[PDB]
């Protein structure tokens, strides 16, 4: 659970890092954001779940 | 201090507050790149 | 040919770093008070 918590929490960080850089260049260059509308959606969706994971999982470590 | 678990992230949170300033800076990076239109 | 905006932003951060190093030294070096 503890490591499982540090996994989710840390992964939530790297994803956000990828997301923060991703979304900009996505909407910017109109070379797509229709194939990236798939990528972005999966990242956004995943992000929320991760937050909820770390959320509940928090009351189990600390 | 930060809850025992998050303690690993203590160094990370040490820098977070300054981030907003960077945005003000970033806007200048952009304008420079776009050759100040 | 190296894009001007990159030259400035790199030399820019480079100045903030060295200058920020000076401000750190205000709390550690001989210029401290401890």
């Amino acid at each position: 659970m503890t490591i499982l918590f540090q996994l989710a929490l840390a992964a939530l960080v790297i994803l956000s890092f990828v997301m923060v850089i991703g979304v900009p260049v996505a909407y910017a260059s109109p070379q797509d954001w229709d194939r990236s509308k798939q990528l972005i959606f999966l990242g956004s969706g995943l992000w929320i779940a991760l937050v909820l994971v770390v959320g509940v999982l928090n009351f189990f470590v600390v | 201090k930060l809850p025992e678990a998050y303690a690993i992230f203590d160094p990370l949170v040490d820098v977070l507050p300054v981030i907003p300033v960077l945005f003000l800076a970033l806007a200048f990076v952009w304008q420079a790149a776009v050759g100040f239109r | 040919r190296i894009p001007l905006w990159i030259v400035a932003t790199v030399a820019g951060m480079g100045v903030i770093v060295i200058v920020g190093l000076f401000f750190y030294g205000a709390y550690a070096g001989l210029g401290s008070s401890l």
Binding site: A28, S29 | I19, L22, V29 | -
Partner: peptide
Amino acid sequence: IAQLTMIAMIGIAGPMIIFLLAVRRGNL
């Protein structure tokens, strides 16, 4: 001990999200 590793990445991140745009050329 040395969280300068953090700043560095998040610091170069800013110019990156527009540098990649100078490569893919568009919407600046």
